[PDB]
Structure 1
């Protein structure tokens, strides 16, 4: 579950949502952007300087995007495996899925 820099509307840190199993086999990748604007939504997952940011930030699961791999840039961090349960929790509530 790596964290790259990606070219969205502008350069932002993103969470690779697409499974790393099939990543070298696809021309596109689904990502979740990371913005410093914390809005206090359930669909957010906190990330901080431990993950690889300057100021504290959040993974915005309501704004997931599938971008070309050409727009995927430097690898700058990782989502800790202890945060994985909350990621599934964020996506399930974001889309109303029966996890």
Structure 2
């Protein structure tokens, strides 16, 4: 998926890309350097677009307006898409 920058934190775009231009909001998942090693965390480093080993926190999923979405700084590798699918799954119980 498409890690972008938003007010200021790096976020992972959870909202499906298809309907993105047709919505005034977007569901994203913040990224923190504070890694706790949970099932709700998806590890991401500089390969992903960042500049420090961090994690995608699926526990703090937030929906924000598009005018608070900013510069696209990075990519989430397709190989990681199952992991993500699991993290969320574990964050919400399924």
TM-score when normalising by structure 2:
0.94
More strand by percentage: 1
C-alpha displacement of 1:4: 3.3
Task: Give the alignment's Cα RMSD to 1 decimal.
Answer: 1.0
Taking the aligned partners of 1:89 and 1:29, their CA distance within structure 2 comes to 21
Gaps of 5+ in 2: none
TM-score when normalising by structure 1:
0.89
How many pairs were matched up?
Answer: 93
User: Segments of 4+ in structure 1 off by > 2 A?
Assistant: 1-6
Gaps of 5+ in 1: none
Contact 2:20–2:26 (CA<8 Å) still a contact in 1? yes
**CA distance 1:3–1:79, shift in 2 (3 Å):** farther
